[PDB]
Amino acid sequence: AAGTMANLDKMLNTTVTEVRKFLQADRVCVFKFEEDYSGTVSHEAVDDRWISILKTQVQDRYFMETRGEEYVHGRYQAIADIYTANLVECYRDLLIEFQVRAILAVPILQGKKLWGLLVAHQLAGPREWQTWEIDFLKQQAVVMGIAIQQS
Amino acid sequence: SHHHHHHGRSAAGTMANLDKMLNTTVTEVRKFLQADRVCVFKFEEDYSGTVSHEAVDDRWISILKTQVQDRYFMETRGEEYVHGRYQAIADIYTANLVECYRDLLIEFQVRAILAVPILQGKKLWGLLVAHQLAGPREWQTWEIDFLKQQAVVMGIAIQQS
Amino acid sequence: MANLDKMLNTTVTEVRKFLQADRVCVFKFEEDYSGTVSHEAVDDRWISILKTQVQDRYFMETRGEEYVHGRYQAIADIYTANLVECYRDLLIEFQVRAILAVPILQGKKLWGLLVAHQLAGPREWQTWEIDFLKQQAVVMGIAIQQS
Amino acid sequence: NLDKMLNTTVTEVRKFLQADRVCVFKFEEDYSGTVSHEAVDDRWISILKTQVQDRYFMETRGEEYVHGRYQAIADIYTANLVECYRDLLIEFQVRAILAVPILQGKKLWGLLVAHQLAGPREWQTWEIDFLKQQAVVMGIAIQQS
Numbered sequence: 001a002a003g004t005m006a007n008l009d010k011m012l013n014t015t016v017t018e019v020r021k022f023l024q025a026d027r028v029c030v031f032k033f034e035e036d037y038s039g040t041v042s043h044e045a046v047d048d049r050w051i052s053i054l055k056t057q058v059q060d061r062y063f064m065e066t067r068g069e070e071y072v073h074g075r076y077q078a079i080a081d082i083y084t085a086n087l088v089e090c091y092r093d094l095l096i097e098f099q100v101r102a103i104l105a106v107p108i109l110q111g112k113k114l115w116g117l118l119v120a121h122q123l124a125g126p127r128e129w130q131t132w133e134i135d136f137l138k139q140q141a142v143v144m145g146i147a148i149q150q151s
Numbered sequence: 152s153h154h155h156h157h158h159g160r161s162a163a164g165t166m167a168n169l170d171k172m173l174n175t176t177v178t179e180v181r182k183f184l185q186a187d188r189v190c191v192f193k194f195e196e197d198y199s200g201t202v203s204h205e206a207v208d209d210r211w212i213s214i215l216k217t218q219v220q221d222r223y224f225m226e227t228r229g230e231e232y233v234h235g236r237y238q239a240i241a242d243i244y245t246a247n248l249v250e251c252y253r254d255l256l257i258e259f260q261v262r263a264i265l266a267v268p269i270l271q272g273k274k275l276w277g278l279l280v281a282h283q284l285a286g287p288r289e290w291q292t293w294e295i296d297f298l299k300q301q302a303v304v305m306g307i308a309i310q311q312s
Numbered sequence: 313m314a315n316l317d318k319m320l321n322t323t324v325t326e327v328r329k330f331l332q333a334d335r336v337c338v339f340k341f342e343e344d345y346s347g348t349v350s351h352e353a354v355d356d357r358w359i360s361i362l363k364t365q366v367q368d369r370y371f372m373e374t375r376g377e378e379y380v381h382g383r384y385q386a387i388a389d390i391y392t393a394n395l396v397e398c399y400r401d402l403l404i405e406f407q408v409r410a411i412l413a414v415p416i417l418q419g420k421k422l423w424g425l426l427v428a429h430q431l432a433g434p435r436e437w438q439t440w441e442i443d444f445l446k447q448q449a450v451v452m453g454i455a456i457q458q459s
Numbered sequence: 460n461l462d463k464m465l466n467t468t469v470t471e472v473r474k475f476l477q478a479d480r481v482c483v484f485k486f487e488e489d490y491s492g493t494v495s496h497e498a499v500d501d502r503w504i505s506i507l508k509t510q511v512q513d514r515y516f517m518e519t520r521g522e523e524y525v526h527g528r529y530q531a532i533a534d535i536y537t538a539n540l541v542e543c544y545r546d547l548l549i550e551f552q553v554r555a556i557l558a559v560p561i562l563q564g565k566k567l568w569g570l571l572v573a574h575q576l577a578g579p580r581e582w583q584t585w586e587i588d589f590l591k592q593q594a595v596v597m598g599i600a601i602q603q604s
């Protein structure tokens with residue numbers, strides 16, 4: 001089993017790098033949840049021009065109160081412009097600290113449990129996420145799920 | 152011999168085809184879930200809408216044809232519902248809701264509500280809604296998944312009609 | 313149980329009308345992956361196969377494992393497909409020309425198939441129709457898992 | 460560049476599944492094909508650019524594969540295979556083969572294939588799922604290029 005965790009860590013790191021290149025996003029990361037649905041940016045591919053947010057811990061009220069239940073039942077986040085969208089102010093402030101203009105966040109499941117998020121950020125400017133891109137990030141999060149379960 | 156897709160859709164009588172299918176679906180979903188009401192809320196271009204299809208236990212007042220000017224939908228144009236948001240409330244009396252929305256639900260005799268999006272391509276077309284009117288109802292995870300999956304098939308039927 | 317069975321009989325009836333198929337049926341597997349036509353909507357022009365029991369070698373040998381991993385059947389014209397002769401003769405006995413069959417899953421189990429037949433003639437199943445019958449089978453699966 | 464992306468994927472899939480070879484078999488108009496992309500352990504022959512005229516695929520135009528058919532063979536010596544097919548695999552040093560379809564919209568564009576070359580291999584249900592889900596993501600990449 002040693003080192004299958006290093007093998008998963010290499011695999012998730014390669015995946016976020018290829019997804020960021022393919023979608024031409026500024027940042028792609030994995031947000032991994034703890035037991036209480038706080039979490040940490042576990043994996044990040046970021047264009048050198050921008051803040052690396054790797055290992056930033058986030059205590060998000062929405063995830064910690066719902067324990068991600070809506071994301072197990074098909075809710076996800078597609079925001080073209082964080083200024084446009086009616087976000088709770090402190091959540092918008094967190095995204096601005098991350099330099100975020102646009103965000104796409106889809107779930108990574110283990111069975112019936114939310115393990116984490118796969119997240120694309122546009123940092124340069126607003127971005128209208130297309131149907132195929134949302135579908136692509138969701139399908140990549142399924143690949144990640146299978147890999148995580150089997151390591 | 153080869154099956155052709157004409158399907159007699161040039162007939163004025165086939166306008167009500169989609170309405171008949173949707174009426175059968177809400178009737179059968181109400182019985183299967185043993186809900187007091189199942190209805191379709193159809194949106195207009197400004198994301199006001201109407202209760203377009205309803206199955207309701209005859210005890211309760213019919214809300215069929217009720218027009219609703221919902222601030223959340225009219226302000227968002229249903230963008231969060233296009234991206235999979237839904238409502239699943241066991242007890243609307245105890246829930247943290249805006250009071251004017253609670254009052255609308257109370258006027259509909261609602262104690263519990265499960266409301267999921269219906270899409271037509273990339274557009275929010277409507278909501279599929281189950282109500283418990285007799286008393287509160289803890290909606291199960293499988294019932295949320297059920298009603299979402301029923302709305303997927305209804306979205307296909309709306310697209311292909 | 314009556315409530316589930318009514319939902320299933322209504323479903324094959326409505327699916328048959330919507331797709332303009334000649335037959336729509338549920339094939340329910342037994343423990344040996346033999347099966348029964350358990351639910352059927354058919355035009356009166358054609359023979360009812362409701363309650364027919366089928367001992368299909370492909371299903372009995374695989375126990376439907378390929379169907380749990382995304383294989384399904386979409387045949388426009390059984391007379392031009394390259395079918396095992398004893399399966400083609402079963403389909404001929406059912407007056408089949410075109411067949412679309414998708415799995416009904418109960419968790420990880422292949423519980424059955426949701427099946428559309430064209431009997432009048434061949435039929436090129438469209439991508440949307442395949443996706444539609446798969447999504448209707450997911451509705452049926454969710455219900456059967458909870459009844 | 461799509462070819463860079465497909466090469467990265469077969470390379471990382473091969474490492475993750477610990478296969479001896481992962482490649483893409485890309486179909487021509489007549490459902491002949493060529494290995495277009497290959498990650499192989501240097502111990503074994505490279506089959507990159509090999510053109511194959513496959514009787515099953517050219518006759519069926521891979522319709523069963525458009526509809527989810529796949530091949531999971533633990534041991535090509537103890538599999539009920541047409542000898543000219545078992546002979547194509549032996550030529551490639553294959554012992555075990557997992558092959559799943561790659562779709563471009565509704566067309567069968569190619570296959571994503573894992574070979575074990577060292578010895579036989581009991582493919583696991585999760586691996587069939589993993590490789591099919593890689594093929595889904597590839598299909599989307601291919602369609603949008």
Ligand SMILES: *C(=C)[C@@H]1/C(=C/C2=NC(=C\c3[nH]c(/C=C4\NC(=O)C(C=C)=C4C)c(C)c3CCC(=O)O)/C(CCC(=O)O)=C2C)NC(=O)[C@@H]1C
Nearest residue numbers: 031058059060061062076077086087088090091094105119
């Ligand atoms: C104020 C109390 C803040 C707070 C509470 C809320 N957060 C909310 C939504 C939320 N949080 C996330 C998490 C991330 N997105 C990312 O890119 C990263 C880093 C990669 C993280 C950690 C998402 C995706 C969402 C939206 C979920 C959804 O679909 O609703 C909300 C409710 C929604 C809103 O109005 O914003 C509240 C309230 N979070 C904070 O961090 C501070 C403490």
Ligand SMILES: *C(=C)[C@@H]1/C(=C/C2=NC(=C\c3[nH]c(/C=C4\NC(=O)C(C=C)=C4C)c(C)c3CCC(=O)O)/C(CCC(=O)O)=C2C)NC(=O)[C@@H]1C
Nearest residue numbers: 190192219220221222223237238248249251252255266280
């Ligand atoms: C006050 C101005 C009222 C109002 C505005 C709001 N609607 C809100 C949310 C909402 N609306 C619906 C709609 C329905 N539920 C149904 O059963 C039917 C009919 C069958 C309809 C049309 C839903 C499902 C939701 C929940 C949205 C969500 O957040 O997921 C809200 C905010 C919600 C809250 O916090 O309570 C407001 C404000 N609607 C009115 O008609 C009056 C004018």
Ligand SMILES: *C(=C)[C@@H]1/C(=C/C2=NC(=C\c3[nH]c(/C=C4\NC(=O)C(C=C)=C4C)c(C)c3CCC(=O)O)/C(CCC(=O)O)=C2C)NC(=O)[C@@H]1C
Nearest residue numbers: 339366367368369370384385394395396398399402413427
């Ligand atoms: C010979 C031994 C016969 C036999 C065996 C085989 N069946 C095969 C495939 C198969 N069977 C089914 C079942 C149905 N089709 C229906 O309409 C209904 C009723 C509504 C049933 C029960 C399906 C869907 C398939 C196709 C599976 C696939 O995708 O391959 C096969 C191999 C397939 C082939 O022909 O190439 C064999 C062999 N069935 C019999 O009853 C006799 C005994």
Ligand SMILES: *C(=C)[C@@H]1/C(=C/C2=NC(=C\c3[nH]c(/C=C4\NC(=O)C(C=C)=C4C)c(C)c3CCC(=O)O)/C(CCC(=O)O)=C2C)NC(=O)[C@@H]1C
Nearest residue numbers: 484511512513514515529530539540541543544547558572
């Ligand atoms: C004889 C004429 C040979 C031949 C014909 C056949 N091919 C058959 C099936 C088939 N072909 C493939 C293709 C590949 N597998 C690979 O690893 C690669 C390269 C990376 C290729 C191109 C697969 C996966 C299958 C199996 C299909 C299935 O699921 O059945 C068959 C019949 C299959 C059987 O044995 O049942 C014949 C006959 N191909 C040749 O090139 C020679 C000339």
